[PDB]
Amino acid sequence: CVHHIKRRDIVLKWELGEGAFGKVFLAECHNLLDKMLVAVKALKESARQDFQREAELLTMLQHQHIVRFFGVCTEGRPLLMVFEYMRHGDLNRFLRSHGPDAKLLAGGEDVAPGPLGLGQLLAVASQVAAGMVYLAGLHFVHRDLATRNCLVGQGLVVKIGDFGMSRDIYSTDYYRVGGRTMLPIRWMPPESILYRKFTTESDVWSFGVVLWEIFTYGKQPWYQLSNTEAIDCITQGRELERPRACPPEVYAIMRGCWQREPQQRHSIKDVHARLQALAQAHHHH
Ligand SMILES: COc1cc(-c2cn(CC(=O)Nc3cc(C4CC4)nn3-c3ccccc3)nn2)ccc1-n1cnc(C)c1
Ligand SMILES: [Cl-]
Numbered sequence: 198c199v200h201h202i203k204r205r206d207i208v209l210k211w212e213l214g215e216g217a218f219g220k221v222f223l224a225e226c227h228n229l230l231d232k233m234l235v236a237v238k239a240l241k242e243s244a245r246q247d248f249q250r251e252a253e254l255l256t257m258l259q260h261q262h263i264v265r266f267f268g269v270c271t272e273g274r275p276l277l278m279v280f281e282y283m284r285h286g287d288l289n290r291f292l293r294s295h296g297p298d299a300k301l302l303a304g305g306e307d308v309a310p311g312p313l314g315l316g317q318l319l320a321v322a323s324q325v326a327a328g329m330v331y332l333a334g335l336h337f338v339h340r341d342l343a344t345r346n347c348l349v350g351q352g353l354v355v356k357i358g359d360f361g362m363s364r365d366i367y368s369t370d371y372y373r374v375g376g377r378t379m380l381p382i383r384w385m386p387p388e389s390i391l392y393r394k395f396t397t398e399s400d401v402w403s404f405g406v407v408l409w410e411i412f413t414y415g416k417q418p419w420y421q422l423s424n425t426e427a428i429d430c431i432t433q434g435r436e437l438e439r440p441r442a443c444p445p446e447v448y449a450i451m452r453g454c455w456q457r458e459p460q461q462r463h464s465i466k467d468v469h470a471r472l473q474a475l476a477q478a479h480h481h482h
Pocket of ligand 1: 213214221236237238251254255258263264280281282283284285286287332339348357358359360361362
């Protein structure tokens with residue numbers, strides 16, 4: 198039940214990013230909800246079946262913390278996928294520009310430049326956890342949860358996607374095991390690195406790594422290490438250090454996501470419930 202969009206109704210503004218399989222542009226869309234900003238993904242190239250499967254999946258996935266999908270454009274070439282426009286771009290970039298050095302990075306006119314506070318970091322964390330609760334409820338395995346795969350809209354609205362253009366400007370976040378198989382090893386637990394076992398339990402481990410990215414203002418996990426050294430540390434069971442901005446109670450949540458046995462990891466629903474309770478308790482303080 199994929200919604201179709203006339204090519205005449207899409208006005209491309211500029212190219213945001215490019216990957217091996219697609220191109221993402223900022224665009225204007227007419228008669229969707231007159232003149233609306235949207236983000237358009239163009240299919241570069243089998244590929245048409247993957248595009249069809251994705252469009253169907255994105256029409257079915259509907260949640261306030263999953264990237265909004267408006268439809269496709271199958272009239273002519275390239276094939277297009279229309280997504281919502283999220284002003285603040287990807288969450289990794291957003292965290293890096295609203296960190297301890299935000300004042301140095303800020304434009305002269307930027308509103309109240311400075312590092313995000315605890316309340317804001319907990320609201321970002323709780324929103325990503327809510328999206329992961331929804332996917333787990335559908336028995337859907339993301340396999341590449343990371344802040345680079347989240348978008349931030351005006352009003353600190355956070356939504357999860359799966360971009361693969363992430364595999365271009367964030368090519369350093371992937372390890373090539375062979376051919377075209379790019380693994381986000383720094384976000385993966387030992388069973389995924391060793392045997393490519395991806396489940397809702399390997400996604401909860403990645404959510405723990407997302408919490409660490411959030412509380413370090415977007416640092417790359419294991420940044421001190423090469424890909425082979427990070428693989429060795431993870432399989433040996435080394436844990437990421439508690440971030441300076443991370444309260445001990447948030448680090449206890451990360452540790453719950455990082456239990457060695459996948460079945461011993463806390464469920465994403467309990468992780469979200471705990472994050473939502475900490476965000477509520479801090480609201481007025
Ligand atoms: C990086 O920025 C954007 C990048 C996209 C975008 C979208 N997609 C596809 C995409 O997100 N796909 C997707 C989402 C999911 C959900 C987690 C469950 N699953 N899959 C999925 C499934 C099977 C196979 C491949 C993917 N790729 N790029 C869109 C807007 C934006 N942007 C906005 N605003 C701005 C300024 C940019
Ligand atoms: Cl602890």
